[PDB]
């Protein structure tokens, strides 16, 4: 179903951009493991910065996970998902800590987090 005529042009482009960033991050893994980020170029460091936040934002809190952890679940529309990933790719939230993107719903929840802690 991931075709431009089925999901829409912007949805398709956002998905492809996210996959490209994740692929680049996966390629950088062995160098990062051996000797860290200190020898990466400026663009590679930006790629890592975006990719970690994207990977964390791909997490979600499920309704059925209420039994394991007390956090209630969330339902996220596809429009909100696309808009949030587009905003992350555009660099709007590069200043937020990466731990704020874990196990949330909309990007508004990411923004609400990092306020209960340091902003």
């Amino acid at each position: 179903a991931l075709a431009p005529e089925i999901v829409g042009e912007e949805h398709y482009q956002v998905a492809r951009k996210v996959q490209q960033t994740l692929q680049r991050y996966k390629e950088l893994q062995d160098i990062i493991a051996i000797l860290g980020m200190d020898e990466l170029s400026d663009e590679d460091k930006l790629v890592v910065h975006r990719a970690r936040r994207i990977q964390f934002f791909l997490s979600q809190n499920f309704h059925v996970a209420e039994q394991f952890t007390g956090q209630p679940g969330s339902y996220v529309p596809v429009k909100e998902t696309v808009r949030g990933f587009k905003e992350i790719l555009e660099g709007k939230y590069d200043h937020l800590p990466e731990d704020a993107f874990r196990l949330v719903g909309r990007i508004e929840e990411v923004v609400e987090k990092a306020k209960a802690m340091g902003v």
Binding site: I34, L35, G36, D38
Partner: protein
Amino acid sequence: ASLRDIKTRINATKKTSQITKAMEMVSTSKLNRAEQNAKSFVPYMEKIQEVVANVALGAGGASHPMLVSRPVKKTGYLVITSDRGLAGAYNSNVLRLVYQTIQKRHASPDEYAIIVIGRVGLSFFRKRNMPVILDITRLPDQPSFADIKEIARKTVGLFADGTFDELYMYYNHYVSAIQQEVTERKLLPLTDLAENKQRTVYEFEPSQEEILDVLLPQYAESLIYGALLDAKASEHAARMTAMKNATDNANELIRTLTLSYNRARQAAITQEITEIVAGANAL
């Protein structure tokens, strides 16, 4: 993966581990020697600090000691960076601070200029569009008194001829093998002295204010050494720590890859013997 791929990965990782171990062992000795050089520098710094703190307050004035030079203008920035990578965040830590200060407190490429030591900082600034006036790139690992004499004299002269309003210097100060601190120091105008017994000079005076015109440019060599020796020590310590961390990571990767290789070998042997026995008993 396959046995051959895992074996090649193990061999490459072992070569990398050996190279990093050799680099670390070299850097340890280089740091040890840099510490002795910094220790040797001390008495000259002490005597010149005392004599300046005495004389410069001798009821007089000059361009260097005044609170404000020629009305506020272009600010001078001197940054010290290594000429080669593999030093961890050594260069980036200083460069981020310098970039932040320049972008925040000037907001115009007219009222500042940059002097860089080392190839890394030069490349960092030339990748952007910030002007660089003077630079020196290749230096001994243990510089002697005459190594950067020309650059230091020119840096002082740029303040002397009114081209600069003030000088700030940024470098890494050595605290420990694992901790180095980025430091910003107000170089010119010096604006501060040591609180000592001001009258103890007894110099046979040719002229009490004329001697300052010679002393102050020579006291300015705080820039050439009090920062550069710490910079070299921090660079060698950073190289040592980064190389040992890399060696440890390589050893851990070798261990995990060896475990994977042994599992693959056992699986291959089992599969081969099972296929042979099945073919044998199929008759």
